[PDB]
Symmetry: C3
Amino acid sequence: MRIVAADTGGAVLDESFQPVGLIATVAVLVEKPYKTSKRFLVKYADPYNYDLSGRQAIRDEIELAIELAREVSPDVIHLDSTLGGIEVRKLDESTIDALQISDRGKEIWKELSKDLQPLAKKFWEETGIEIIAIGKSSVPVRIAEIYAGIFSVKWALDNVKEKGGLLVGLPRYMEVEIKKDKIIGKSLDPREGGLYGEVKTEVPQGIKWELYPNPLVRRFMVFEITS
Amino acid sequence: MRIVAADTGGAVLDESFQPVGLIATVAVLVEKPYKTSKRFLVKYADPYNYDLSGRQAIRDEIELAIELAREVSPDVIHLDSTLGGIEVRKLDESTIDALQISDRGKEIWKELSKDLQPLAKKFWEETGIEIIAIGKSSVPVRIAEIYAGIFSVKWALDNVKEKGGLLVGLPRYMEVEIKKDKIIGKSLDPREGGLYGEVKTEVPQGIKWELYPNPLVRRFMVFEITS
Amino acid sequence: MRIVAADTGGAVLDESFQPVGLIATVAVLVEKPYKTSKRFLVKYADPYNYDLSGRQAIRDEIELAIELAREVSPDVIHLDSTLGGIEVRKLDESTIDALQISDRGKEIWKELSKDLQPLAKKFWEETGIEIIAIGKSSVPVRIAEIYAGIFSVKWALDNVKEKGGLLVGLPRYMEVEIKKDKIIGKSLDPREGGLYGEVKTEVPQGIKWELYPNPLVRRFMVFEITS
Ligand SMILES: [Mg+2]
Ligand SMILES: [Mg+2]
Ligand SMILES: [Mg+2]
């Protein structure tokens, strides 16, 4: 199978570890053995002006996934919404209320439906490719998320000399290593079977960084950097 | 404590990783230090003709557990249904509706009750041994599950030359190693404290195998083999 | 951030692994990098005369947290109740029923409210320090819990020659190592990012101990000791 997926991750935090906004939306192509991606797109948000409700993220995600899928012709697109793998082109109001999910989950999706259902329907008509609301069940979605963490660290590297110091909340239970002009991201959960990513990027001189637990959100790490 | 438990696991998958049917039901005897089993029974299903609803599995499980328990006289039997450890001989309709579980969980159990409650009651009258619906809380159930994964890999080894190629979905977050005429199965979750199993079986020549993440089901691995 | 947190853990078990009562309540001060504590208080319960409902634990916890906080002046106290981080001084009845939790969760808290809400309100008036019901989201709460496990092993060491043999159920997925007059406790979950604790205490001669899975409670270990 060849799968395109997308997710958003990486948060700028304040000094009390409260999220200000998110940093990176990433679309990935994933193929066997489904542990990493060698083909991906990133869109950087403005974390100092972000919508933390989930709406902005999923819209950026589905658009970036479609952008990558138009090029690499995957068998399917995985979207990060955990709805049991239903096709997004089928998500009209009546289908959404029938879903076995939360009522505010239904709130958000009945609002998203107006744009996303026609979008997925048109993309399917054009390409035959489904966009499925699989969410946390998807390994390609998790690989996208790990890359969003990696690209959030790239963003921190690229912005810390202007900003002085940054606190970046990473996606759940992942670490990064910074080597000579390379960031490697790895899941911390061995149950996931060895998921990772790598981005080549220039590491500036005159910086120091550290990775440690977010004390307010168990199993999430913080990347702290100063110049 | 000496505990008999049972579970079913291992799925034949198609090329899109969709489950066709399950492969192995295993009953284990587990004693201190509760990390593995050295005494077990296996029943192989026909995965190309299986009931994926859960009904077939739990019936095969309770029968195989009783078969092993009749020999090894455990203190208790653990059944893989997560109902808080209630004795199955007590599971009449009124008790089942009183349970703090899903209504389709109640659906399945009110149907199973007609056979399983009298079965557990009779076994208890004969032996004093309870059959408890403990499910995911039980370590012996997880050890049975790991052995079902192992025996599913044995089944793949034994059938791949006739079948040409096989995709086996393993139970959640476990790996296998194939050594000289031995399969070793291990949990991937260090939180479980080092659970494992081993089955001695002939490894055929002229095969190649690989273990990798199921991209559609996070934290589940696939064993792929060709001849 | 400087955080005080508390939790209770460690259970005396009978020979069928059933809990008799809990052993240690611990308050910790946690600072960057939020992996351990070097400043803590312990209160030992009488496990052979304990209230397993949760009431005794949370009362001992909030009092011990306040006792430590009065000395070390943390920015905040984390209490082990998972209510989304609401301030305990705000937990009147109407707020509790408004919470998005279980109805027996509301049962317990509407009873606790009569003492704990005025207590938290007074402490805040005195110090400006909030007591927040953050629960499982808190890393400092987990570090307190790991120390409760460690101190429960100290309690077992200190009592095994009078008791002959003890079975101690540890907090979820943690291990201990016993070195020369030191107990080291570590989380078994690498997703938590390397949480640990250490207590210096005399290890008696003429004992043997073992750590292994609790077969009735997956991902929880037992510390067994005899003299
Ligand atoms: Mg997401
Ligand atoms: Mg099962
Ligand atoms: Mg607690």
